[PDB]
Amino acid sequence: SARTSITRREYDEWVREAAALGKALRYPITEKMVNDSAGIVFGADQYDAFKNGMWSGEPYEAMIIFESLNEPAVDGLPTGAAPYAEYSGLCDKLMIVHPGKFCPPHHHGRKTESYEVVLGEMEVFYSPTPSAESGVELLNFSGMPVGSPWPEGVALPKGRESSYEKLTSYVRLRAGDPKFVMHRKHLHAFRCPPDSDVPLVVRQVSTYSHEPTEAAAGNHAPIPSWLGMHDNDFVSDAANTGRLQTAIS
Amino acid sequence: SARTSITRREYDEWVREAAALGKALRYPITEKMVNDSAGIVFGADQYDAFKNGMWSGEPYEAMIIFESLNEPAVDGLPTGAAPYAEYSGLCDKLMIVHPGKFCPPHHHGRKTESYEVVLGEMEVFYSPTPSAESGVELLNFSGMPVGSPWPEGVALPKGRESSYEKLTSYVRLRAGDPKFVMHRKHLHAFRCPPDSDVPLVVRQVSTYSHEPTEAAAGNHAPIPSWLGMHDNDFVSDAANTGRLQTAIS
Amino acid sequence: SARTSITRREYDEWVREAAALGKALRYPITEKMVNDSAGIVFGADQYDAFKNGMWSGEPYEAMIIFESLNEPAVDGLPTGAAPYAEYSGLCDKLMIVHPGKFCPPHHHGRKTESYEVVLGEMEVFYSPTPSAESGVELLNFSGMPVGSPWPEGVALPKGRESSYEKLTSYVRLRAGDPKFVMHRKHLHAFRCPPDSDVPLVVRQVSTYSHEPTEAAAGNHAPIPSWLGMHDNDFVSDAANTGRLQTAIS
Amino acid sequence: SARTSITRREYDEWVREAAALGKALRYPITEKMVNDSAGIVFGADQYDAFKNGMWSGEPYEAMIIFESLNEPAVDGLPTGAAPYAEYSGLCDKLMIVHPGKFCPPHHHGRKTESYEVVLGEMEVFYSPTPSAESGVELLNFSGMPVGSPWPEGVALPKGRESSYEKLTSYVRLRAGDPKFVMHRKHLHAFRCPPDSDVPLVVRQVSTYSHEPTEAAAGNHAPIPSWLGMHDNDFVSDAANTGRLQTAIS
Ligand SMILES: O=C(CO)[C@@H](O)[C@@H](O)CO
Ligand SMILES: O=C(CO)[C@@H](O)[C@@H](O)CO
Ligand SMILES: O=C(CO)[C@@H](O)[C@@H](O)CO
Ligand SMILES: O=C(CO)[C@@H](O)[C@@H](O)CO
Ligand SMILES: O=C(CO)[C@@H](O)[C@@H](O)CO
Ligand SMILES: O=C(CO)[C@@H](O)[C@@H](O)CO
Ligand SMILES: O=C(CO)[C@@H](O)[C@@H](O)CO
Ligand SMILES: O=C(CO)[C@@H](O)[C@@H](O)CO
Ligand SMILES: OC[C@@]1(O)OC[C@H](O)[C@@H]1O
Ligand SMILES: OC[C@@]1(O)OC[C@H](O)[C@@H]1O
Ligand SMILES: OC[C@@]1(O)OC[C@H](O)[C@@H]1O
Ligand SMILES: OC[C@@]1(O)OC[C@H](O)[C@@H]1O
Ligand SMILES: OC[C@@]1(O)OC[C@H](O)[C@@H]1O
Ligand SMILES: OC[C@@]1(O)OC[C@H](O)[C@@H]1O
Ligand SMILES: OC[C@@]1(O)OC[C@H](O)[C@@H]1O
Ligand SMILES: OC[C@@]1(O)OC[C@H](O)[C@@H]1O
Ligand SMILES: OC[C@@]1(O)OC[C@H](O)[C@@H]1O
Ligand SMILES: OC[C@@]1(O)OC[C@H](O)[C@@H]1O
Ligand SMILES: OC[C@@]1(O)OC[C@H](O)[C@@H]1O
Ligand SMILES: OC[C@@]1(O)OC[C@H](O)[C@@H]1O
Ligand SMILES: OC[C@@]1(O)OC[C@H](O)[C@@H]1O
Ligand SMILES: OC[C@@]1(O)OC[C@H](O)[C@@H]1O
Ligand SMILES: OC[C@@]1(O)OC[C@H](O)[C@@H]1O
Ligand SMILES: OC[C@@]1(O)OC[C@H](O)[C@@H]1O
Ligand SMILES: OC[C@@]1(O)OC[C@H](O)[C@@H]1O
Ligand SMILES: OC[C@@]1(O)OC[C@H](O)[C@@H]1O
Ligand SMILES: OC[C@@]1(O)OC[C@H](O)[C@@H]1O
Ligand SMILES: OC[C@@]1(O)OC[C@H](O)[C@@H]1O
Ligand SMILES: [Co+2]
Ligand SMILES: [Co+2]
Ligand SMILES: [Co+2]
Ligand SMILES: [Co+2]
């Protein structure tokens, strides 16, 4: 009785409620943002999240993301920055994670992120050590803070506990806290505490998001290389694929 | 009886109330953000705004900006992007403009902006035509939309009406609207309608903000060139100077 | 395949999401308010609402109510007001109605209500004519406004269309509108427009709510008569019973 | 240099900003609610609050109240309740108190109140002992909770420290807390902590408010006795008078 997809009703209810919560919190959600790509389930084995539901508190990798902005910011750029334009751009998204659920371990080669908790509390797991890129020298300025060790008793998704191994640092963010930056090339993940009375709602402001998603298929590329470019590297292979498409029955 | 500065009481009341409004609207304002650089008056001749006050509805160039993020995003960047890192980075700020007041005409060579109206309505004046940069070729992708002609009867600050000449396009933005992008190298300005019952509150998400302001004096530069770099070009000279410092008596 | 009850999962998800929406909107929801009495389905035949779900837009009589206050206000009252204390008291509740769903036709003999729309829009159907009370003279002051005729094409719950007959007046309320008063002894009902992108959220401030509900069973009576007193008279008999208990399987 | 009135500019700025804060917090404020009666200063000697301003943190008795509802609730009442209708009715108001400022000691003979903190924290001082009414027996049900002793170092308005003597009980309320009831015939007062970064915003839901204020002069009385009826008894005589009118120069 292992779920392999989500019913149209489960999907619509999940995403529509999330959009309303977003609107209540004053996030500018338009009609086109409420689509079949907003609700993400990272891998077939994660559809079991809808076995007991989004309020069961069980650890699964699934989340909602409403993207209000993903601007290349290529206009006005000297032609020389062309090869580096992919590290810039502006992206604004609202992320909604239910109790116990996770945005799984992954890293970006080009995208730097920042978090602003709007509702609930966010538990961020990450590697304070950045990854390297074979053959290319990289700049450094502030790097990432070390944070604290994980609190005791964190329930990880069954069959994916090892994917969190390297994300040794932990920080719990709350509404009103200073903005938190997740530099590119750093492994990161996050969840909404299982005992939370509300879904975790986080505003993410980042550089351009290269994600050839279902709702992405059908857009013009500002620069050749960008075409089909995927800037998401999930530690769990089963998470990289499902990331781009949601099975709705 | 022309004002040349703002009293400490006028300043504190202006900024503290604005911060509370910001908090009420869920913008993450920390203590360090509420300082003597938050309240901006663009030029000595604009201090007359406090002659009758921020609720008089008279046209003056003054505004409040609370910056929650100004991240260089240099970490993890290949060394080659060093000369172009200044066109990237992440900046999050809350802007508060009272009825009739303006954020004066200006343009940025490196910074691209985006607007999200949180409270009230925003009247944006801009040039759909970007400016050129002597000797350097520039990329183009989407450019700016033409918008509409100005509505009739817009009261401009006395003695600065000509600075708005080239900003022929107009767009009125409201809460819930799609994000609006102001590409770098485009002249832009905005005001809160004079008949508004509430101050205009706008969330600005942009690339790095190079502004050697009073609260800026005393920060490490991620890259040599960035040091003291000012990326703001106001059409009105009296606005470029006052931008960096507020006279509080 | 006609539903006769709601599953524990459907109930919890319905009420927990509603509570989060309420919190997002700053309504003071405590743990004890999130119980098995919050989600109301008016009659067995209305459980079919969960056949297609709360986002189907179909007309059914079901809603959520979180009560933050139900104060008798008997303390300090001269003993003579004892028999009339039941017409007073203070009650504060947040009401959440999904698209197309209704709070069914009913009237109160003692309770006067008021509505404040927090999210979405509220369509109120009511009788501008108050009902009489055999043998007892009644006071009059402002009475109810006539309002407008019903808009065309209002889909009513199947098998209960006649219960709306006498509620000839219509008013559509929005956030920011003046408070709307529903005087005692007036038939009233309301729904969230079927095409609404968000659940209707309304703050109700009224005199004491005499409702021997499931979560009510087990409270001290400030005055003898109040014990077990039910002040709700639904035009539809199938709505009076189900009002007090929700079948959760 | 003792203030005896508030300038039109000081008044408008005080009330207009407060209204905007209220709107930001989703309180339904209409145009007619933003008038010259909204800003209250309890006595000539309290105008010195505007000597240093509403953000000085000094102890003075002044506040803002926006009334969205004051419904007699007389309609549908059996004629016998006529003499007791004055203890009922519905009143909804938003109260805004700046740091260090107080709503001064007073009690109501007919009105029972309840508090819901929307922004900031509320420090309530009150007498757990109700006052008696010569010759008339009174009902009792729950009475008031004892609360805690006052915290140390509470700065009271100069020249009115004795008016707080009997208000021995203290409770600090926060957003999200259960509704707090202030029964009629109990002395009560409250302030916004002097170190608060935001004005205290509280939603008050109470029975009818008999207050022949400036904005009150010119309304029909639902019942004879109600005419000109004042249900506010301030311990400080200088507070009873100024309560009904604000001196605006
Ligand atoms: O990509 C953009 C513009 O940045 C949006 O129109 C979409 O993400 C839909 O909101
Ligand atoms: O990167 C993140 C969260 O770290 C989101 O913007 C999405 O890319 C997750 O798939
Ligand atoms: O610059 C940063 C980090 O981006 C902030 O700490 C300051 O702007 C203060 O909010
Ligand atoms: O650029 C803007 C508004 O266009 C702000 O971020 C400040 O730079 C205005 O001085
Ligand atoms: O009844 C009261 C007090 O008025 C509340 O405690 C309950 O309704 C639970 O919120
Ligand atoms: O009266 C109403 C809505 O008219 C609510 O407070 C509940 O009593 C509905 O059952
Ligand atoms: O009194 C009433 C109705 O209760 C309101 O119209 C005024 O208080 C103005 O808001
Ligand atoms: O009673 C209160 C606060 O206790 C308010 O509603 C006003 O009456 C204060 O003047
Ligand atoms: O609007 C889509 C939907 O939610 O409405 C009815 C059906 O259940 C489907 O899931
Ligand atoms: O594609 C639109 C839609 O069906 O997809 C998700 C959301 O429920 C919306 O109704
Ligand atoms: O609206 C946000 C989103 O779901 O829509 C497109 C993209 O896939 C992103 O995940
Ligand atoms: O030391 C390199 C590494 O193993 O440590 C952290 C980074 O993610 C990379 O995987
Ligand atoms: O106890 C925390 C931890 O060691 O356990 C699992 C995860 O790898 C994390 O590093
Ligand atoms: O806190 C600073 C201040 O507002 O408080 C008192 C004085 O008026 C000054 O302007
Ligand atoms: O520098 C801090 C401060 O005085 O500056 C502005 C704000 O009023 C705050 O009180
Ligand atoms: O808090 C925002 C701000 O006022 O502080 C620093 C910078 O000058 C910016 O204008
Ligand atoms: O044509 C160039 C120009 O005059 O037009 C718009 C741009 O701002 C520049 O000033
Ligand atoms: O009427 C609008 C306008 O022509 O008047 C002033 C400004 O230059 C703008 O272009
Ligand atoms: O917490 C209760 C619940 O939602 O959690 C799991 C099960 O589905 C049940 O409905
Ligand atoms: O009784 C408590 C509860 O189970 O009832 C409804 C809500 O879901 C909560 O979890
Ligand atoms: O919390 C609100 C409520 O559901 O709880 C008790 C009462 O039945 C009311 O309907
Ligand atoms: O005229 C009396 C009546 O029929 O009209 C309205 C009220 O509800 C009652 O039912
Ligand atoms: O058309 C509206 C109406 O006449 O139709 C049904 C309901 O009785 C209402 O009075
Ligand atoms: O609108 C009224 C006012 O605020 O506007 C100008 C003058 O200062 C007066 O106080
Ligand atoms: O009477 C209206 C008014 O002048 O009074 C107070 C508020 O400032 C508003 O502008
Ligand atoms: O709007 C609220 C108010 O100021 O207006 C009328 C009454 O005096 C009350 O104090
Ligand atoms: O005992 C009566 C009394 O003195 O105590 C409390 C009440 O306010 C009254 O003033
Ligand atoms: O210390 C608190 C207190 O005793 O001091 C003043 C006020 O009367 C209150 O009762
Ligand atoms: Co990421
Ligand atoms: Co700009
Ligand atoms: Co009712
Ligand atoms: Co009172």
CB contact under 8 A, D130 and C76: yes
State whether the beta carbon of B168 lies less than 6 angstroms from ligand 17: no
Supply B113's token pair: 């902006």
Amino acid letter, residue D60: Y
Supply C61's token pair: 């009589």
The Cα angle at residue C88 between residues C83 and C92, in degrees rounded to 5:
145
What's the length of chain C? 249
Q: Which helix (H) or strand (E) holds C107?
A: strand C102-107
| Among candidates D13, D21, D197 on the partner chain, residue whose Cβ is nearest the Cβ of B55 | D13
Closest CA relative to residue D118, chosen from C167, C68, A33, B114: C68
Does the CA dihedral A40-A46-A49-A50 come out positive or negative?
Answer: positive
- The DSSP letter of residue C157 is P
Supply D119's token pair: 């922004």
- The DSSP letter of residue C226 is G
Atom 1 in ligand 28: residue holding the nearest Cα: D150
CA C18 to chain centre: 15
Supply D97's token pair: 């108190």
CB C232 within 8 A of CB C108: yes
Q: Kindly list the structural domains of chain A, giving each domain's residue range(s) and its CATH number in brackets, ordered by start.
A: 1-249 (2.60.120.10)
CA distance C120 to chain A (A): 10
Supply C136's token pair: 């007892």
Ligand 32 geometric centre to CA of D187 (Å): 8
Q: In what order do the strands lie in the sheet with A188-191?
A: A169-174, A121-126, A188-191, A102-107, A233-234
State whether the beta carbon of C168 lies less than 6 angstroms from ligand 23: yes
CA B21 to chain centre: 18
| Among candidates C16, C23, C201 on the partner chain, residue whose Cβ is nearest the Cβ of A55 | C16
What is the Cα–Cα distance from D11 to D9, expressed in whole angstroms?
5
**Residue the block writes with tokens 């999330």:** A18
| Among candidates A68, A78, A206 on the partner chain, residue whose Cβ is nearest the Cβ of B137 | A78
Closest CA relative to residue A41, chosen from A230, A199, A213: A213
What is the Cα–Cα distance from C235 to C247, expressed in whole angstroms?
21
Ligand 11 geometric centre to CA of A37 (Å): 5
Q: In what order do the strands lie in the sheet with B121-126?
A: B169-174, B121-126, B188-191, B102-107, B233-234
| Distant-in-sequence contacts of A127-132, Cβ < 8 A, 24+ apart | A127/A166, A127/A167, A127/A168, A127/A169, A127/A186, A127/A187, A127/A188, A128/A168, A128/A169, A128/A186, A129/A186, A130/A183, A130/A185, A130/A186, A130/B75, A130/B76, A131/A107, A131/A185, A131/A186, A131/A187, A132/A185
Phi, psi torsion values for C137, nearest 5 degrees: -75, 145
What is the Cα–Cα distance from B51 to B59, expressed in whole angstroms?
12
For residue D80, the SS3 value is helix
What is the Cα–Cα distance from C235 to C212, expressed in whole angstroms?
18
CB C40 within 8 A of CB C243: yes
Measure Cα distances from A128 to A170, A172, A204, B157 in Å. Answer: 10, 15, 19, 50
| Among candidates C20, C55, C198 on the partner chain, residue whose Cβ is nearest the Cβ of A23 | C198
**Residue the block writes with tokens 């913008």:** B27
What is the Cα–Cα distance from D38 to D63, expressed in whole angstroms?
8
- The DSSP letter of residue D148 is B
What is the Cα–Cα distance from C14 to C53, expressed in whole angstroms?
10
What is the Cα–Cα distance from A150 to B171, expressed in whole angstroms?
49
What is the Cα–Cα distance from A137 to B78, expressed in whole angstroms?
6
- Closest residue in A to B186 (Cα–Cα): A76
Phi, psi torsion values for D41, nearest 5 degrees: -125, 120
Ligand 25 geometric centre to CA of D9 (Å): 10
**Ligand 4 pocket mutation, candidates B41, B46, B90, B95, criterion most atoms within 8 A of CB:** B95
Strands (E), C112-179: 113-119, 121-126, 169-174
Supply D54's token pair: 């509403």
- The DSSP letter of residue C159 is T
CB contact under 8 A, C9 and A119: no
Task: Find all residues with CB under 8 Å of A194, minimum gap 6, and list them.
Answer: A57, A59, A99, A100, A155
**Ligand 8 pocket mutation, candidates D42, D106, D244, criterion most atoms within 8 A of CB:** D106
Supply D103's token pair: 């709503």
Which residues in C198-221 are b (16+ Cβ under 10 Å) and which e? Answer: bbbbbbbbbbbbbbebebbeeeee
What is the Cα–Cα distance from B28 to B22, expressed in whole angstroms?
8
Supply D177's token pair: 């807390």
Closest CA relative to residue C119, chosen from C166, C69, C173, C81: C173
CB contact under 8 A, D9 and B198: no
Q: Which helix (H) or strand (E) holds D182?
A: strand D180-182
Which residues in A39-76 are b (16+ Cβ under 10 Å) and which e? Answer: bbbbbebbbbbbeebbbbbbbbbbbbbbbbbbbbbbbb
CB B24 within 8 A of CB D24: yes
Closest CA relative to residue A95, chosen from A231, A206, A8: A206
Closest CA relative to residue B10, chosen from D38, D4, D13: D13
Measure Cα distances from A85 to B15, B86, B192, B228 in Å. Answer: 37, 11, 34, 24
CB contact under 8 A, B205 and A69: yes
State whether the beta carbon of C232 lies less than 6 angstroms from ligand 21: no
CB B126 within 8 A of CB B187: yes
CA distance D213 to chain B (A): 24
> In chain B, what residues touch A28 (CB-CB under 8 Å)?
116, 175-179
B contact test, residue of A67, A74, A88 with most B CBs within 10 A: A88
What is the Cα–Cα distance from B62 to B114, expressed in whole angstroms?
20
CA distance C110 to chain A (A): 33
> In chain C, what residues touch A64 (CB-CB under 8 Å)?
none
- The DSSP letter of residue C18 is H
CB contact under 8 A, D21 and B19: no
> In chain B, what residues touch D199 (CB-CB under 8 Å)?
20
| Distant-in-sequence contacts of D54-57, Cβ < 8 A, 24+ apart | D54/B13, D54/D14, D54/D98, D54/D99, D54/D101, D54/D199, D55/B9, D55/B12, D55/B13, D55/B16, D55/B17, D55/D98, D55/D99, D56/D100, D57/D99, D57/D100, D57/D194, D57/D195
| DSSP bridge partners of D39 | D64
What is the Cα–Cα distance from D74 to D82, expressed in whole angstroms?
8
CB A109 within 8 A of CB A202: no
> In chain B, what residues touch A75 (CB-CB under 8 Å)?
112, 130, 138-143, 183-185
Task: Find all residues with CB under 8 Å of B119, minimum gap 6, and list them.
Answer: B21, B25, B175, B198, B199, B200, B201, D20, D23, D24
Atom 10 in ligand 20: residue holding the nearest Cα: C12
CB contact under 8 A, C9 and A52: yes
Amino acid letter, residue D62: A
Q: Which helix (H) or strand (E) holds C188?
A: strand C188-191
> In chain D, what residues touch C79 (CB-CB under 8 Å)?
136-139
Measure Cα distances from B123 to B35, B43, B49, B65, B97 in Å. Answer: 27, 22, 19, 17, 11
**Residue the block writes with tokens 């004053």:** A26
CB C152 within 8 A of CB C64: no
Determine the angle formed by the axes of helices D8-24 and B8-24, rounding to 10 degrees: 20
Ligand 19 nearest-atom number relative to CA A57: 5
Closest CA relative to residue C239, chosen from C39, C45, C67, C3: C45
Does the CA dihedral B228-B231-B237-B243 come out positive or negative?
Answer: negative
The Cα angle at residue B224 between residues B222 and B227, in degrees rounded to 5:
80
State whether the beta carbon of C211 lies less than 6 angstroms from ligand 5: no
State whether the beta carbon of C16 lies less than 6 angstroms from ligand 19: no
**Residue the block writes with tokens 């203030």:** D3
> In chain B, what residues touch A121 (CB-CB under 8 Å)?
none
What is the Cα–Cα distance from B117 to A132, expressed in whole angstroms?
40
What is the Cα–Cα distance from C72 to D87, expressed in whole angstroms?
12
Closest CA relative to residue C117, chosen from B146, A157, D27, D213: D27
Task: Find all residues with CB under 8 Å of A217, minimum gap 6, and list them.
Answer: none
Task: Find all residues with CB under 8 Å of B17, minimum gap 6, and list them.
Answer: D17, D21, D55
Ligand 29 geometric centre to CA of A107 (Å): 6
State whether the beta carbon of A16 lies less than 6 angstroms from ligand 10: yes
CB contact under 8 A, C12 and A119: no
What is the Cα–Cα distance from D182 to C206, expressed in whole angstroms?
17
CB D192 within 8 A of CB D101: yes
Measure Cα distances from A67 to A38, A173, A202, B88, C231 in Å. Answer: 8, 21, 12, 20, 48
Closest CA relative to residue B7, chosen from B32, B29, B39, B34: B39
CB-count exposure of residue C141 (10 Å: 0-12, 13-18, 19+): middle
Task: Find all residues with CB under 8 Å of D130, minimum gap 6, and list them.
Answer: C75, C76, D138, D143, D144, D183, D185, D186
| DSSP bridge partners of B242 | none
Measure Cα distances from C145 to C127, C141, D109 in Å. Answer: 10, 12, 32
What is the Cα–Cα distance from A16 to B204, expressed in whole angstroms?
27
| DSSP bridge partners of D173 | D122
Phi, psi torsion values for D52, nearest 5 degrees: -100, -15
**Ligand 20 pocket mutation, candidates C23, C30, C34, criterion most atoms within 8 A of CB:** C34
- Which region, left, alpha or beta, applies to residue B141 given φ > 0 means left and ψ of -120 to 50 means alpha? alpha
Supply A199's token pair: 């879904």
Helices marked H in chain D: 8-24, 49-52, 237-244
Reported resolution, Å: 2.0
- The DSSP letter of residue D214 is T
- The DSSP letter of residue C11 is H
**Ligand 11 pocket mutation, candidates A65, A70, A91, A208, criterion most atoms within 8 A of CB:** A65
What technique was this entry resolved by? X-ray
What is the Cα–Cα distance from D115 to C24, expressed in whole angstroms?
19
Measure Cα distances from A46 to A95, A124, A155, B163, D6 in Å. Answer: 18, 20, 15, 58, 64
Ligand 29 geometric centre to CA of A168 (Å): 16
Query: What HEC string does chain A produce?
Result: CCCCCECHHHHHHHHHHHHHHHHHCCCCCCHHHCCCCCEEECCHHHCCHHHHCCCCCCCCEEEEEEEEEEECCCCCCEHHHHHHHHHCCEEEEEEEECECCEEEEEECCCCCEEEEEEECEEEEEECCCCCCCCCCCECCCCCCCCCECCCCCCCCCCCCHHHHCCCCEEEEEECCCCCEEECCCCCEEEEECCCCCCCEEEEEEECCCCCCCCCCCCCCCCCHHHCCCCCCEECCHHHHHHHHCCCEC
- Closest residue in B to A109 (Cα–Cα): B76
| Among candidates A69, A175, A185 on the partner chain, residue whose Cβ is nearest the Cβ of B179 | A69
Amino acid letter, residue D172: R
**Residue the block writes with tokens 């070390």:** A146
What is the Cα–Cα distance from B89 to B94, expressed in whole angstroms?
17
Q: Regarding beta strands C113-119 and C180-182, do their DSSP bridges make them parallel or antiparallel, or are they unpaired?
A: antiparallel
> In chain D, what residues touch B54 (CB-CB under 8 Å)?
13
| DSSP bridge partners of A102 | A61, A191
CB C71 within 8 A of CB C43: no
CB A247 within 8 A of CB A4: yes
- The DSSP letter of residue D178 is P
Task: Find all residues with CB under 8 Å of C50, minimum gap 6, and list them.
Answer: C3, C6, C7, C10
Ligand 9 nearest-atom number relative to CA A12: 4
What is the Cα–Cα distance from B88 to A84, expressed in whole angstroms?
10
Closest CA relative to residue B246, chosen from B2, B58, B57, B46: B46
What is the Cα–Cα distance from A210 to A70, expressed in whole angstroms?
9
What is the Cα–Cα distance from D211 to D113, expressed in whole angstroms?
14
Query: What HEC string does chain B produce?
Result: CCCCCECHHHHHHHHHHHHHHHHHCCCCCCHHHCCCCCEEECCHHHCCHHHHCCCCCCCCEEEEEEEEEEECCCCCCEHHHHHHHHHCCEEEEEEEECECCEEEEEECCCCCEEEEEEECEEEEEECCCCCCCCCCCECCCCCCCCCECCCCCCCCCCCCHHHHCCCCEEEEEECCCCCEEECCCCCEEEEECCCCCCCEEEEEEECCCCCCCCCCCCCCCCCHHHCCCCCCEECCHHHHHHHHCCCEC
Q: How many CB pairs under 8 A join B and D?
A: 62
Closest CA relative to residue C60, chosen from C189, C205, C168, C226: C189
What is the Cα–Cα distance from C167 to B151, expressed in whole angstroms?
45
Closest CA relative to residue A120, chosen from A184, A14, A218, A191: A191
Determine the angle formed by the axes of helices C8-24 and A8-24, rounding to 10 degrees: 20
Other C-beta atoms within 10 Å of A219: how many?
11
**Residue the block writes with tokens 């709503």:** D103
CB A72 within 8 A of CB A175: no
CB contact under 8 A, B139 and A76: yes
